[PDB]
Design a protein around this ligand. Structure first.
Ligand SMILES: Nc1ncnc2c1ncn2[C@@H]1O[C@@H]2COP(=O)(O)O[C@H]2[C@H]1O
Ligand SMILES: [Mg+2]
Ligand SMILES: [Mg+2]
Length: 233
């Protein structure tokens, strides 16, 4: 009744998909973890570059788990995903992302493994730091992940395990973290740790620096690692 030969883009713009709800929960760090994070963030250390070794070690442990889980669950052999790590600096956003195709984490794994449960070595490690230990000793005390706060003001962890949905963990320290369901970009099995770098820590976006610290500290990953470099415009 109202003939048309051509429409403007706004006229044929599709209706939005239904808005999704994401459930968010907020948790306090275990008291000694909170102490540790306050000590890490607010103290000068000479050797901050070991954060990357700690996050790559976590990824390598998650990748090893794939191989062994196949002994009680052979279907993982059928995945076509390569077992690998990618490092992804974004100079536009000032973030460094460590991506793996390991086993991932469930929601309860994020809550229990990344903040609420005591690590037995945490008090000993804070005393070793007081007595002048090098921050590099952190992984030997079972709290390596929190080294990310040597260089990052905020950390976001996106993760997907076969036995659960995709979740995001996030914390800017200050004593709390959040876990929420993540209905955004499905990432497939594995974990992405997104470091929001502090203003004076932007050297960890540079490709030569990243290659230097991988070669110095992470030579026995056991899986291919790949550094994605944004082409300079
Ligand atoms: N990349 C990752 N993939 C899977 N789990 C992780 C990752 N990073 C940290 N974690 C979990 O966080 C925990 C930190 O302490 P652990 O190294 O004992 O065990 C670690 C894993 O359970
Ligand atoms: Mg370990
Ligand atoms: Mg190994």
């Amino acid at each position: 009744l109202v003939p048309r030969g051509s429409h403007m883009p706004e006229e044929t713009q599709t209706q939005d998909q239904p808005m999704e709800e994401e459930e968010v929960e907020t948790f306090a760090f275990q008291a000694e973890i909170a102490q540790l994070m306050s000590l890490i963030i607010n103290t000068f250390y000479s050797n901050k570059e070991i954060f990357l070794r700690e996050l790559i070690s976590n990824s390598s442990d998650a990748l090893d788990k794939i191989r062994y889980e196949s002994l009680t669950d052979p279907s993982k052999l059928d995945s076509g995903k390569e077992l690998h790590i990618n490092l992804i600096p974004n100079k536009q956003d000032r973030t460094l992302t460590i991506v793996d195709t390991g086993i991932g984490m469930t929601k309860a794994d994020l809550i229990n493994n990344l903040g609420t449960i005591a690590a037995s070595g945490t008090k000993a490690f804070m005393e070793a730091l007081q007595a002048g230990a090098d921050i590099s000793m952190i992984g030997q005390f079972g709290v390596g992940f929190y080294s990310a706060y040597l260089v990052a003001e905020k950390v976001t962890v996106i993760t997907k395990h076969n036995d659960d949905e995709q979740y995001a963990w996030e914390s800017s320290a200050g004593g709390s973290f959040t876990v929420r369901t993540d209905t955004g970009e499905p990432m497939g099995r594995g974990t992405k740790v997104i470091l929001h770098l502090k203003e004076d820590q932007t050297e960890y976006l540079e490709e030569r620096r990243i290659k230097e610290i991988v070669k110095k500290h992470s030579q026995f990953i056991g899986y291919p690692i790949t550094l994605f470099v944004e082409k300079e415009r």
